[PDB]
Structures are given as C-alpha cells and as structure tokens.
Swiss-Prot record, chain A:
Function statement: Involved in mRNA splicing and cell cycle control.
Known partners and oligomeric status: Belongs to the 40S cdc5-associated complex (or cwf complex), a spliceosome sub-complex reminiscent of a late-stage spliceosome composed of the U2, U5 and U6 snRNAs and at least brr2, cdc5, cwf2/prp3, cwf3/syf1, cwf4/syf3, cwf5/ecm2, spp42/cwf6, cwf7/spf27, cwf8, cwf9, cwf10, cwf11, cwf12, prp45/cwf13, cwf14, cwf15, cwf16, cwf17, cwf18, cwf19, cwf20, cwf21, cwf22, cwf23, cwf24, cwf25, cwf26, cyp7/cwf27, cwf28, cwf29/ist3, lea1, msl1, prp5/cwf1, prp10, prp12/sap130, prp17, prp22, sap61, sap62, sap114, sap145, slu7, smb1, smd1, smd3, smf1, smg1 and syf2. Interacts with sde2.
Domain of life: Eukaryota
Species: Schizosaccharomyces pombe (strain 972 / ATCC 24843)
First and last residues shown, out of full length: 153 to 202 of 757
Protein name per Swiss-Prot or TrEMBL: Pre-mRNA-splicing factor cdc5
Compartments, as annotated in UniProt: Nucleus
Family note: Belongs to the CEF1 family.
Disulfide bonds: none
UniProtKB/Swiss-Prot annotation, chain B:
Subcellular location: Cytoplasm; Nucleus
Membrane-spanning parts: none
Protein's UniProt name: Uncharacterized protein C20H4.06c
Organism: Schizosaccharomyces pombe (strain 972 / ATCC 24843) (Fission yeast)
Covered range of the whole protein: 25 to 234 of 534
Curated annotation (Swiss-Prot), chain C:
Protein name: Putative pre-mRNA-splicing factor ATP-dependent RNA helicase C20H4.09
Keywords: ATP-binding, Helicase, Hydrolase, mRNA processing, mRNA splicing, Nucleotide-binding, Nucleus
Function: Pre-mRNA processing factor involved in disassembly of spliceosomes after the release of mature mRNA.
Domain of life (superkingdom): Eukaryota
PROSITE patterns, alphabetized: DEAH_ATP_HELICASE, HELICASE_ATP_BIND_1, HELICASE_CTER
Origin species: Schizosaccharomyces pombe (strain 972 / ATCC 24843) (Fission yeast)
Subcellular location: Nucleus
E.C. number: 3.6.4.13
Chief location of this protein within or outside the cell: nucleus
Domain Helicase C-terminal positions: 200-379
Boundaries of every Helicase ATP-binding domain copy: 16-180
From Swiss-Prot, chain E:
Full-protein interval shown: 7 to 49 of 674
Listed name of the protein: Pre-mRNA-splicing factor cwf4
Subcellular location: Nucleus
Similarity comment: Belongs to the crooked-neck family.
Subunit (UniProt): Belongs to the 40S cdc5-associated complex (or cwf complex), a spliceosome sub-complex reminiscent of a late-stage spliceosome composed of the U2, U5 and U6 snRNAs and at least brr2, cdc5, cwf2/prp3, cwf3/syf1, cwf4/syf3, cwf5/ecm2, spp42/cwf6, cwf7/spf27, cwf8, cwf9, cwf10, cwf11, cwf12, prp45/cwf13, cwf14, cwf15, cwf16, cwf17, cwf18, cwf19, cwf20, cwf21, cwf22, cwf23, cwf24, cwf25, cwf26, cyp7/cwf27, cwf28, cwf29/ist3, lea1, msl1, prp5/cwf1, prp10, prp12/sap130, prp17, prp22, sap61, sap62, sap114, sap145, slu7, smb1, smd1, smd3, smf1, smg1 and syf2.
Biological function: Involved in pre-mRNA splicing and cell cycle progression. Required for the spliceosome assembly and initiation of the DNA replication.
Length: 50, 185, 626, 48, 43
RNA sequence: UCUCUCUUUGCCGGCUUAGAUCAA
C-alpha cells in the first residue's frame, strides 16, 4: 500500500522521464522565442504608453 | 569573499563532483595545474604592468633606498605555499612524546617499582596489535591461507597502474619471504 | 502499594540492622527490585536522616538521578525538592529542607575537595556502582579514606554485579557484611551452537526466523556489536516480511542505540496491537535502565563495541570485544521477566569457558588527567599513596603527568604552578579547555572563549537529518559559514541564537539543537560563578572584529593539537602523525595550510579530527619561542 | 545496492521504458531503475 | 503503522504510467494578442 | 429547404565502430 518513499520518488522520476520527449536542448529555442516575444511586447507597450 | 555559493557541492563525493571552477567556469589555468595557458595570457607580465622605483644615492639619499623583502615580489600562490612550507623548530614536542623530564616526574612519584606493574588496559593496548575482529564469531578459528596484509616521474594520475608500472629493477624481499629450513621426510 | 510489593520490604529490618551494625554494607540485588528507590525511604523511616542528618545517594547517571529523585519525591507524597531533590553535574535542584539527596559522582568529588570530611552527611549510599565509572571508583577510593577518618559515617553499597569479595578484601572483612538479596527469576535455559559460527548475524537471523515460525508469541531482543549492523538487520527482516508465510507473525524490527534521537528511542515502547511481534535490534542499550516488558527470547552475538583511548597518540577508537561472562549472564537473565524465556547464545560452552569474568572499570578505561587534577587538588604529591581499588597503568599516569607538565599546570617538581595550577584544579572541565578560560582575563575577551567552552562541553550544536532536509539544513546553515573555521561559525551561531530571543521555531527552522544550547547556557553561568570565585570580571568582550587574540588564547589551550597540510590531502601533526579531516567540518577541501583541532577519533584506516579551525604560522612561531 | 527481487513497480516501469525506447537501449532503460543494471534488465525482459 | 504489506487492490499498470505521464501536458500557450491601433503597427 | 448531433469517410530530418562510454 505504501511502497516506502524511495520507490515513490523513482516512480515520479520515471513519470517525468516518459513524457519528456522534445529532445534535450530544444528547450532553448522555444525559451528564446518566448523571451523575444516578451521583449517585443514590452517595447510595443512602451511605444503605446508614450 | 563570500566563499562563492557553497550549495553546489551538496553531497555527491569525489567521483561525482563536476569539475573545479576557478571563476565558476569549467577550465584550468597554470602550466602545472593542467591549463594550456600560464601567466597573464601565455606571458610573464601583468594587467597593469610593472615599473622600477626611482634611484638616488648620495651617502644620505640612498638611506631612503632601503633593501628588498620577501613579500614584495611574490604573488598569492607564492605566499600561500610559503605559509605551507614553513616547518622547523619543534624540539619540545619531540622530547616528551612517543620520557626524560618524566623520569624526574617518576622521582616525584616515588616510583620504587623495581619490578614494573601493569594493568589490563595494557592487554587492551596489546589488542591494538591483535585485531579489530572481521565480523566473525567468538569461536571461529579462521584460516591462515586467507589472511593477507624507486621513484621518478609519474605515468599520469589518470593513466592508472598495471603490470606495466612496476620496478623492473627488483632486489626486495631478501629473506622475509623464504623459510630457513624445510622438512625432508 | 507498589512500595510493599517489592521483595526488599521483607528485608527492611535486616537491612537496617546491617546498615547500623556494619560501618560498610554491600547490598547485592537486581535492578528494579527497589534498592534504588526504597532504601532511602527505609532508612529515613528508621531515622538515619533525623536531626539535620542527610541521606546522600550517588547516582552516576544524570537522567537516572533525576528520574529516581522525582519518583521518590512523588512516592512519598511530598512536593518535589522539599524532602527529596536532585543535583546532577551543572544542574542543581535542591533545598535546605531536602533530606533525600540524589547526587552525581563529580559534584560529590568537588564537595570532598571543598569539604574533606563531609560533616553535613551522616550516611551516603553508592548506587549503580556496577558500571565502574571513573568518577565512581575515584569516589570509592576517597570514601575509604573518609570512613577511615570518620567512624560515624556509614556506607551502603548497591551493585548489580558479583564483586562483593573484592570489596570485602579492599575494605576489610571485619568492617563489611556481605549480604545478597534473593530475588525471583523464571528459569532461563541457554542454547549453544555445537560448532563455531562464521557469520554471527546470519546465525542470528536464522534463529530469529526459526523462532518466528516455530515458537509462541513473544518479542525478541537481539544483541549486536554496533550501529552498522542495525540497517542490515532492518533490510533482511523486511525481505523476510515480504516473503513471510501466513503461519508466521508480522515481525516488526526496531532499532535501539545511543545515537538515536529520543523519539526514536521512544518508538520501541509503542504497543503494536494485533498479530505483531516486536524485535529490538539493540547494540548495548538494552542492558541497563531499559525495561521493555514481554521480552521472551534473546539471541546474543557475544560481541560488543566499546571505546579505548590511546595516550601515546591521544586518539580514541571504537573496537569490537567479546563480551564478559557477567555480561552474558545479564543478557541471559534479561529475558524471562514476565514469563519463561529462552536464550540462544551464538557460540559453544567451550568458548564461554575462556572469557574474562567482569568488564574492566572506566577508571581503567578513561583519561586520568582529570583524576590526577583531582588528587593534586586534594594535595596528594605522590599518586601511589591513594588507595586505588585496581592499580591504574603506570605508563598512563606518567603520560598524563607529562601532558599536564607541558600544559603548565605542573612545575618541574610536579606541584601546582602559580595560581594557574590551583585554579585549573578547581575547574570541572579538562585542563586544556580551562587554560584558555583562565588566560582570557589577561586579554579581555573572556566572553567569547566562555561561549566556545560552553559549546564544546555541551556538545554538537547542529542537528543533521538523514532525509532530504539535509540540503535544507545546509541552506539553513548557509547564512553562518565562517571563513576562519568551525569554531567561529559556532560563535556566530551562538551569538545570533541568543540574539533571536531563544525562539524554538527558529531552532526548528535552522535545525539547531536547543537542548545543547541551554546546557551551554548553564555551563557558562556556572563558569561565570567559577571565575567570580577568583574575583575575575566576566564582562570582558572584544569590541573589534579581530579574532586573532582569541586564537592566541586557543593556541595556548591547544598547543599539542596543531597540524599542517600534506600534499596527499592528509595533515601532518606537530608530533608526526597522519590524520584526516572529518567530512562534517566546513574546511573539508579548502586546503588550509595550517590547522588546529580539538578531538581525535581513529578508525581502522584513518585518524579523523574534529572541531577544525584555521591558524596562521607566525602566531605559532611566536608562541612556541616563549 | 544493485539487484533485489524485481518488485512490480520496477517491472511495469521496465515495460513502459521498453515501449518508449525499444529492445536495444538497455543502458538508457536501466537509468530509470537505479537498483538494476542493463544486463539485469535484458535478462528479465528476455526471460520473464 | 506503515507496515501494511497487503497487496494493493489496484496495481500500477504501464498504461496508467503513460496516461498519468501525458496528463502533465497542458493546452497550447496563450499569448496576449498584439493590438494594432494605427497604421504603424500594421505595416 | 433550415438547425443540431452522431456515424460512415479514401485520407495528407540522413550517415559511422547499435557513433563511444556511464558506481552513492
């Protein structure tokens, strides 16, 4: 019923493992796109408030 | 100096520790520390530079031109190992360790032992030269076949050891590995 | 009613007669029979404490002393401390109206130091002397002297071991009566292996499984060498539980050792309802002061860990030793309290035939430097004149005396040097730590050295969890990492601890042991009184951040304990000893060129040092030259 | 350390990892089960 | 008593593992749509 | 002929020594 505590943590690790996908370093390109979107939105907002 | 963020080490002992970082960067610097660059930038000089001080001697102006001292020309590594390399004196520690004045102390104690007196603590100090047990039972007799106990530059700390790295010139184990007699019958 | 049920009530008149007609009486009995709690009541009822007389019973354990004092106070229907009180080292709860006083051995030695004849006590009872503590045997030696001088003073000796003949010879047969109480124990049968075992834990686990599968219900108490085997037994017992059969009880494993937190030591007493069979993996804790009922079957490995100190190297090591015959008998008799029980000792009777009968005393297994300070304070020039029950090793005595001489407490003639020597003799602590405190007056920084001493004597002020909160503990500690070593880290932690209103939630958040800090508070208060006994002010603090002169005082206190880094990662002591830094210390890999430690604990391969603090070479050079 | 008795949770994680990775990446699969080695994972998959 | 070794009424299955793995995904990210209030932001 | 719903519904990164290794 209560599989200790270590088995819970390895199950959680495996759960995060199986649905990772998206490669490994593909998390950089989308992050840069989101940062660029935020920077442009801030720039447009400053233009609009001016 | 804030000792850098110390949380990086956590546990994870030696064989899993990432690499040492001089400036939170995975790199080496110094010729004898594993870096492919030594000095400022493969050079002797420094960032600011270095200039000699003005000189003037007239039997009264050279008095202001003092001598040279140890510290003023060394650097942080040099001072660190200068502190590391200072070992001398000792004397008193060696005299009363490992008795001399203690014999006079025994004179104070009125030893008068003639035949010395021993305590079972000394049988336990003999136990310092007996065993620490090897997870065996009280009555376990154990076995005698199962008990066991030049220089130059190095081959490289990562190049490991093998049959390759032993002394080809061997003259050890003169007689300690050899019996003095053998039963013939 | 519980007073009358104990077997000792029927011997009350006889014990009183023996106490009155004999100057010294040896009482032999089993723990929990009433000797600890009912003898004071019995002799108070007789009238020994009448007319200003006091009944002083020595309990060498602080927790045992306090618990027995509270139990006696409550059993007599008197307010605590009014008639019966307790006084343990650096913690006094007594009163002028108190008649039954429970006292520690060290404080009583101090009272002997101030009062050589103990005029306020007519009778003193020595209890739990079977553990043969250093303070206990030194007190026994002085007590032979006071009974020699005082004919009115009476002694009652209570012991759980058969040593009465040796005490009779030491004390003189004409003045001691050897009496033995007749308790009751259900007959316990021993079972022995025909052949010596190779793996005693595997033999124990085999017997534990056979007991579970073939014997009636009953908790099994095991005896194991040390704390390293506990987790191995947990793991094997868990695997056996996974593969347990329906005909076998649900067998719960329970650790029991000295290093556990108190709540873990309380987990064993928990009652497991249903078909649950307890097994107590105890190293040596379940030998004294431990009373789990329902213990039926005990399997004894015959090995116990202990501590031996090396004077030549000033180290201490935890070694495995075969148990003594007395320990085996005690372990066998531990089972059988409530119903009949069986013991399974994992060896042969031929192995039993060779072990030495009783474990050697702690006066023969501890550091005698406090003992030599005590005797020299009483005024004994020649150590051989004192009536030792067992002669201590001469080489240990000369080693301790030479250590004391190089410390400066003794002159070339072996007498106390200056006010320093006598003041050190008056100190409860060791001479090494006391030297810094006594010399701090010359430098006006007594406060921080006092805090350092209180932290050192109280113990470890940090708590290290075994779960993931260890990282949280590191972060909790991350605010107070001092570049100069662990000692100044402890000073900073202590300063902010008193600067945080003694908040217990703060101690939980920072994973800090509040009990140790309180004990350090009591230590510093009593040492403040100790210095004020010499009219030394204790308001001296260093207003500057320069801890250098505090380090001068420490180097005066830890002259021998210096070391410098070697290329191999180890450190070379000034005495040419290879030591290794403990992982706990902050300066584990900082590669500090010169280091200073306090305590050394030695393992089978590496000698580890504790309480690491960095130093500078020129301080040491200037200190050694003068 | 390494090994044990192959609890059901380990076996099901093994099945899922084989589904996601294939039958030729036993090192990557064994990274999930910290108590087992790639040889052990391969032996269990091909034997049970 | 944390010692109820009774086999669980429900056993962890692989398909459960993958289903509760994929539940970790959310909807596609919703960015605040850019507003074009004059010809400049249009061109 | 509208509206909604269901169902039917054919359907729209490569190579090499598996690139090479892996104990808290």
């Amino acid at each position: 019923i209560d599989m200790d505590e270590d088995e819970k943590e390895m199950l959680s690790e495996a759960r995060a493992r199986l649905a990772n996908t998206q490669g490994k370093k593909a998390k950089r390109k989308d992050r840069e796109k989101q940062l660029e979107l935020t920077r442009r939105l801030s720039h447009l907002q400053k233009r609009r408030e001016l | 100096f804030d000792l850098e963020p110390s949380r990086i080490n956590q546990g994870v002992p030696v064989w899993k520790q990432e690499a040492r970082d001089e400036r939170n960067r995975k790199r080496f610097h110094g010729a004898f520390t594993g870096g492919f660059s030594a000095g400022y930038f493969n050079t002797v000089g420094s960032k600011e530079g270095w200039q000699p001080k003005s000189w003037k001697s007239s039997r009264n102006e050279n008095k202001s031109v003092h001598g040279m001292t140890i510290d003023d020309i060394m650097d942080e590594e040099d001072r660190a190992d200068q502190e590391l390399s200072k070992v001398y004196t000792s004397k008193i520690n060696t005299i009363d360790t490992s008795d001399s004045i203690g014999e006079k102390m025994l004179k104070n104690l009125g030893w008068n032992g003639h035949d010395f007196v021993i305590s079972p603590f000394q049988g336990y100090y003999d136990d310092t030269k007996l065993t620490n047990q090897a997870y065996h039972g009280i009555g376990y007799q154990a076995d005698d076949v199962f008990q066991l106990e030049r220089g130059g530059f190095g081959s490289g700390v990562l190049n490991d050891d093998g049959i390759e790295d032993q002394d080809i010139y061997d003259l050890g184990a003169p007689k300690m590995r050899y019996d003095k007699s053998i039963n013939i019958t | 009613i519980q007073k009358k049920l104990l077997p000792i009530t029927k011997y009350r008149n006889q014990l009183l007669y023996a106490v009155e007609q004999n100057q010294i009486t040896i009482v032999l009995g089993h723990t929990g029979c009433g000797k600890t709690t009912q003898i004071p009541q019995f002799l108070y009822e007789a009238g020994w404490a009448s007319q200003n007389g006091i009944i002083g019973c020595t309990q060498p354990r602080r927790l045992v002393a306090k618990s027995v004092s509270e139990r006696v106070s409550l059993e007599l229907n008197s307010p605590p401390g009014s008639l019966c009180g307790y006084s343990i080292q650096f913690d006094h709860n007594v009163s002028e109206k108190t008649k039954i006083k429970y006292m520690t051995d060290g404080i009583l030695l101090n009272e002997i130091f101030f009062d050589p004849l103990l005029e306020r006590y007519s009778i003193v009872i020595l209890d739990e002397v079977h553990e043969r503590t250093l303070s206990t045997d030194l007190l026994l030696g002085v007590l032979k002297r006071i009974l020699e001088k005082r004919n009115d003073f009476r002694l009652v000796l209570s012991s759980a071991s058969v040593d009465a003949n040796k005490l009779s010879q030491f004390f003189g047969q004409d003045k001691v009566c050897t009496m033995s109480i007749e308790g009751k124990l259900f007959p316990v049968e021993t079972l022995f292996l025909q052949k010596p075992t190779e793996n005693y834990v595997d033999s124990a686990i085999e017997t534990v499984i056979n007991i579970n599968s073939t014997y009636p219900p009953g908790d099994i108490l095991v005896f194991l060498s040390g704390r390293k085997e506990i987790e191995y037994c947990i793991k094997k017992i868990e695997d056996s539980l996974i593969h347990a059969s329906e005909d076998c009880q649900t067998l719960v494993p329970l650790p029991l050792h000295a290093g556990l937190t108190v709540d873990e030591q309380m987990r064993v007493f928990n009652i497991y309802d249903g078909d649950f069979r307890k097994v107590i993996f105890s190293t040596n804790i379940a030998e004294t002061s431990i009373t789990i009922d329902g213990i039926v079957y005990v399997v004894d490995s015959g090995f116990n860990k202990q501590r031996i100190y090396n004077p030549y190297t000033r180290t201490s090591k935890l070694i495995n030793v075969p148990i003594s015959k007395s320990s085996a008998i005690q372990r066998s008799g531990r089972a059988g309290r409530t119903m009949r029980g069986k013991v399974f000792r994992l060896y042969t009777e031929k192995a039993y035939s060779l072990m030495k009968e009783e474990f050697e005393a702690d006066i023969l297994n501890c550091d005698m430097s406090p003992l030599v300070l005590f005797l020299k304070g009483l005024g004994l020039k020649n150590i051989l004149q004192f009536p030792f029950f067992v002669r201590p090793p001469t080489v240990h005595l000369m080693a301790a005396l030479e250590d004391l001489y190089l410390l400066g407490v003794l002159d070339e003639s072996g007498n106390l040097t200056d006010p320093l020597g006598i003041q050190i003799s008056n100190s409860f602590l060791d001479a090494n730590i006391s030297k810094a405190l006594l010399t701090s007056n010359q430098f006006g920084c007594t406060h921080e050295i006092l805090s350092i001493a209180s932290i050192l004597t109280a113990g470890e002020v940090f708590y290290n969890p075994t779960s993931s909160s260890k990282n949280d503990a590191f972060v909790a500690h991350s605010s107070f990492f001092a570049n100069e070593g662990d000692i100044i880290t402890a000073l900073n932690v202590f300063e902010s601890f008193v600067g945080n209103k003694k908040d217990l939630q703060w101690c939980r958040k920072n994973y800090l042991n509040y009990q140790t800090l309180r004990q350090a508070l009591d230590i510093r208060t009593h040492l403040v009184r100790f210095l004020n006994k010499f009219s030394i002010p204790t308001a001296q603090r260093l207003p500057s951040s320069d801890c250098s002169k505090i380090l001068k005082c420490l180097l005066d206190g830890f002259v021998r304990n210096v070391a410098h880094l070697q290329n191999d990662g180890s450190y070379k002591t000034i005495g040419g000893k290879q030591v290794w830094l403990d992982s706990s210390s902050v300066l584990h890999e900082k590669k500090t060129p010169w280091i200073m430690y306090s305590s050394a604990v030695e393992s089978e391969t590496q000698i580890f040092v504790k309480n690491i603090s960095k130093i500078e070479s020129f301080w040491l050079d200037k200190y050694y030259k003068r | 350390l390494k090994g044990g008795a192959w609890k059901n949770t380990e076996d099901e994680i093994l099945k899922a990892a084989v589904s996601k990775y294939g039958k030729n990446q036993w090192a990557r699969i064994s990274s999930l089960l910290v108590r087992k080695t790639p040889k052990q994972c391969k032996a269990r998959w091909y034997e049970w | 008593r944390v010692k109820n070794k009774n086999p669980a009424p429900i056993q962890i299955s692989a398909e459960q593992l993958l289903r509760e793995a994929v539940e970790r995904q959310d909807v596609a990210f919703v960015p605040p749509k850019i507003n074009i209030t004059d010809l400049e932001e249009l061109q």
